[PDB]
Amino acid sequence: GSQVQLAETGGGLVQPGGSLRLSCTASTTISDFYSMGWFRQTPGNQRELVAIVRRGGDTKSGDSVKGRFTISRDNTRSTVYLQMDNLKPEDTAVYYCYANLQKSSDELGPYYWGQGTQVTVSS
Amino acid sequence: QVQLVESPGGSLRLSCAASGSIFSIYAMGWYRQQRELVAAISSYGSTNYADSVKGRFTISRDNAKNTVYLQMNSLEDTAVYYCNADIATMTAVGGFDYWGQGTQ
Amino acid sequence: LQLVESGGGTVQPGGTLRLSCAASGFTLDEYAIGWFRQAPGKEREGVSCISSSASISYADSVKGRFTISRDNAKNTVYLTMNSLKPEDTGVYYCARAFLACGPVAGWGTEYDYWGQGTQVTVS
Amino acid sequence: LQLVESGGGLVQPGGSLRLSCAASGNIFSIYYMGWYRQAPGKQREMVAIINSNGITNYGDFVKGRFTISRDNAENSAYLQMNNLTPEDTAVYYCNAGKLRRTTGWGLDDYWGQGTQVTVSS
Amino acid sequence: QVQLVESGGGLVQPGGSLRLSCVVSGSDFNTYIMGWYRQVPGKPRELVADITTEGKTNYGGSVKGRFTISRDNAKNTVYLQMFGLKPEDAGNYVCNADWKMGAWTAGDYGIDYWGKGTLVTVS
Amino acid sequence: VQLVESGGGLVQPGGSLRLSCAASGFTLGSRYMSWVRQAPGEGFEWVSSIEPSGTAWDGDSAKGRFTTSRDDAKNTLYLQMSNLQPEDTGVYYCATGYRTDTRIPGGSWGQGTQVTV
Amino acid sequence: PFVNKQFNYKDPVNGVDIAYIKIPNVGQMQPVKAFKIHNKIWVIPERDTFTNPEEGDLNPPPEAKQVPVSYYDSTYLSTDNEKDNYLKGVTKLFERIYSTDLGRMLLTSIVRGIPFWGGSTIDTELKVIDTNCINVIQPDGSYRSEELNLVIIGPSADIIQFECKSFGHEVLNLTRNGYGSTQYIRFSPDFTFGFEESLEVDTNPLLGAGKFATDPAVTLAHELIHAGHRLYGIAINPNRVFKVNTNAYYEMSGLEVSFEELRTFGGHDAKFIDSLQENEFRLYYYNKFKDIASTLNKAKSIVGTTASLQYMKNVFKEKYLLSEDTSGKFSVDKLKFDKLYKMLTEIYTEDNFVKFFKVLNRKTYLNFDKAVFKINIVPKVNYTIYDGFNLRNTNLAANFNGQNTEINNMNFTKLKNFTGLFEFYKLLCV
Ligand SMILES: [Zn+2]
Fold this sequence. Notes:
It is classed as antitoxin. Keywords: toxin, antitoxin. The complex is a heteroheptamer. With 123 residues, chain E is mainly β. Chain E has strands at 4-7, 11-12, 18-24, 33-39, 46-51, 57-59, 67-72, 77-82, 91-98, 100-101, 104-105, 113-114, 118-122. Chain E starts with a strand and ends with a strand. Helices cover 0% and strands 47% of the residues of chain F. The complex binds zinc ion.
């Protein structure tokens, strides 16, 4: 296998209304990566897409973080940064880094996931 | 139904035609008799000859007419030359070999 | 889903027996059938096997004497045993394996179903 | 495909701006054209999309202020933005969709460089 | 091969009653899942009532508990008793002889037998 | 394979309670486990499940209120219930498998624990 | 008989043919209830929101950005009755395909097309690949890794976007190196397309309403042909493409069709791939089969199974129809390769299934779908295994009256007219 590994940093406790930033650095260059971003899996529920960016720079985001979750990608440093504002207790979840290395839309290309980073929001 | 029809130091050209309700043919070949293989042509042009007739025998095939040709030149080779064809019928897709009577 | 062996019995040396292996639970076009035997007190050994594409294998102990055949219409694998010797005494089992045949010795769990067997004595 | 954008910049609140975007094919190649906008911190909302059949879709924030047009001859779209409010300050990306038939009917999303629009004074 | 002839159709007034009967030839009547379908041109056959090999009766939506299906295995006959007939019940009533072919029924294939039908009319 | 649930009883409406199940004869972290409940005179209702990976899955029977955990050291499964309602009254079982709805040959159950509210 | 058991969706699990499964490639999905209708063939009667993490919801795009041929209904396949009817409809289509010798041969090739055991870094060791397996949860709570060939899954957001996909390897191209990989087909038996009888009509985007409905058995056989190509690793690269020049409306739209789709339909469409490109692919995949036989001959150890190495070598000898000499060495006979290659690429075509089913169908892939209909093939009064919609000894038996959406109008409920979304082609009549 290719053995791509993703390294997550920056997930702790924050209070309602506060902000928090997550970063994910890959072991290799993230240029030919079809997409790379963040998913979250709230306790007991299915994993949902937070926000990812593709090779061109367009960002795809879920509906439950509008006006709050901003994402940026840096190919030179091989890192994706996720910024989250106006945090609500519903946002308490495990945030997984995500990288899709599709060679094409023909095959469900190799998916790489981070080990998971806990983000808890409580007063 | 379906059946087949066939037609020293010299030249001879053999041919074999298939007929009937044919739904594709996979591989046709000539056999000679104990019977051994002498030449086998595929539907894509792949050939396989026995060492006895390598070089002086040429097998060819036309798919639009379902006919195989065997050009024999510079003739131990005196025996019965059979025609084999793996013909698929619509009720038996991809199977069953077929033979003729065999000419001298 | 059953595999039954039939046709065993007692026969003089030099006699011939044809054993049948009826598959009453599935179609054989996807399964190879291997014939095995277990001598009195000895370990079970492999006799023969026929593949889903009618690829036949025998053991060094029965070549030229035994013949294994295939009847897909009646879903039965036969074993015609000729030139019988007293050393061929034992219980003959037939087992199924997906698509391909296993080795006549040192096989694994590819034979995922075995019949109860039939008894063959040569005296 | 190549998209060229035009006509961004700074506007007084209540003023008007007309964005432009030209595509490298024709209306039969490009099925839809339009505009998205990326707020400072609010995902990437859809502003206006027009179809080759004339079907239009505007974001809920538009409220009849913006009208999207398409010139079929030169295969270019225009977005006339009237009564621009400070909360319309964002970067507006031209969007285009190429009709595909390679492995069935489909559309390829192709984006532009993006032009800054700032409603401030 | 096997034929089904239906009888007992005619004219009836709103609220009247009728008795339809169908005799089936052959030696496999006990195998059959007998039933009655209303055959309408341009529309698929709709199930009025059927009965299984052991006698369990199932009825359609329009019957509203007004019909009764019975089978006499000793006569190879099935019966459809109709009470309180409305003009919506008019049409050709065809008898059906289905049977189980393993995972699927014979009509699902469908090689089941269908009669020509007896006509029921209201005024 | 033995499972013994414990920790039921009475809880006035809106409270909490922590149910536990002590396993033996198998590693609990190596199988899919489930929490199942049953009201008097009704069928079973799947409450929750947990993967060998530790990922839990809550059904609509009680989502957002309940959390399913596991202690690998003590080989014990847990069901942390909160905001209880009379609809949650019943015998709560811990059964092997995922989304266990009924008694299936091969599956293992405990004898259950009564939870009344 | 292809499906021996009659599955009901609410039947309890057993860990054998009915169970909750996780797919190793995703792993983030919650387990879904799956049914094993045959050897190496599973069915998951749910909307596909789990295989692709970037396609995890059924939300449709805005109306203007929707493909002209598309249909969206987030409530479809959400109830237990829809899933149970989905399951019975898919199995019924499998039997209808199996009822023809062409379909029986295709399904046989699919079953024995086990993806290759070539995932080990050691060149002399055979190892399974995570792409070609699923985790089958047992009533014990334990999970069993089971290798498989094909999975039928419900559609994603676009209900009528049927396709045959597979998970990609990190290093290898499993679909184009002879290895093969487990195929996942998004498909629905509850919908079908509306086409037109005439060729000049069906290939014109401006006229046509969907007078005849596609037999869903043909639509399923189409994606099965894609799965057959990909299970033996002989699929043509999707970038190898024929730019259409026969249809004027295709031309002006810049439309192009992949060689894989043209090969899958067969008929006259397969002739757009010239003989030089066909020889390129055949010789290419012949060397791929040669590499597999070479790897098998160098195999000395096997890992991850209690099965013997000789069995695994013989398994892939059976799949690729290799030849074995007295020494036990494997070789690829090129004539037997041409037989298998022609069966997968020329025999198993959509056009041939139309001939075997004796139904009306699109006469080319280079056409314009006219509409989409809601259908229900489960009742025997609507659809049979041997006859489809053209029920024998009825008025539907002649002239394809069963597929006629006006004659047999009660079997087809039009949901969306695609012709109205192709009306932009009116602007080239200036
Ligand atoms: Zn296709």
